[model samples]
Target: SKRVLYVGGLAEEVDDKVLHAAFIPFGDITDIQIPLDYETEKHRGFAFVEFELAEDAAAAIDNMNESELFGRTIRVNLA
Candidate 1:
């Protein structure tokens, strides 16, 4: 199965570009999904970040979980 990371507590303005940049320093990202509220058309304040390998995901969790981003502390967990 693909290695995935659960990214939560995102800021209102966090987008693909912003999220991507935050984690890009760690390693390659295969995919990223930020759920949206269909009715209001806004982000759900969470994201699923897929990495190229499991090691990268674990490393990210170790180094970045609870790290500040856009003034919010992002939660990272294995998904």
Candidate 2:
């Protein structure tokens, strides 16, 4: 199954490892994608996280959504 989370409102400091550390505690992560802006050399204020299990994604949303990360409150929802 395709279990993904659309994460937004990310601070520019949020990066791949930063994401990994935060999300991994919920479950195994199949992918963590953060696209960077070429000119700014930073993430475009969003990310896509795919968990190995759908339930974990759901739980992650419950726990992480509207939660502060890197000093910014992020939005997490099904992708």
Candidate 3:
């Protein structure tokens, strides 16, 4: 089944490509929803990342959670 994770505590500078690259090593990515600031059009500090399988999401949680990106410690949770 598909599994979704809430990826938070991102650096403001983190972009879609960076986020995708960071997680591609784990497994197939189904979707990545990183919202932009309505006014400034900059990336928001969080995103919803969906994996093709629950196991993939689990692997990402174990491997990438709390990892450093753009000098920020990211957190991941089941969503």
Worst 10 residues of 3 by lDDT: 35-44
lDDT of 2 by residue, 22-74 (tens): 99999999999998888886779999999999999999999999999989999
lDDT of 3: 0.87
How many backbone clashes does every candidate have?
0, 0, 0
Top TM-score model: 1
Tens digit of per-residue lDDT, candidate 1, span 1-79: 5479999999889999998998877789999998899999789899998999888888988988999999999999987
Ranking by TM-score: 1, 2, 3
Q: Write the per-residue lDDT of candidate 3 for residues 6-70, one digit (tens) a residue.
A: 89998877877888999988889988999788889777799988999899899999888898898
Q: What ranges in model 3 sit over 4 Å off?
A: none
Evaluate all candidate structures by whole-model CA lDDT and list the values in order: 0.90, 0.92, 0.87
Q: Please give the distance, in angstroms, between residue 34's alpha carbon in candidate 3 and its true position after superposition.
A: 0.7
Instruction: Name the candidate that leads on lDDT.
Output: 2
Candidate 3 pairs with clashing backbones? none
As a whole number from 0 to 100, the lDDT of residue 49 in candidate 1 is: 88
Candidate 1 Cα errors over 4 Å, as ranges: none
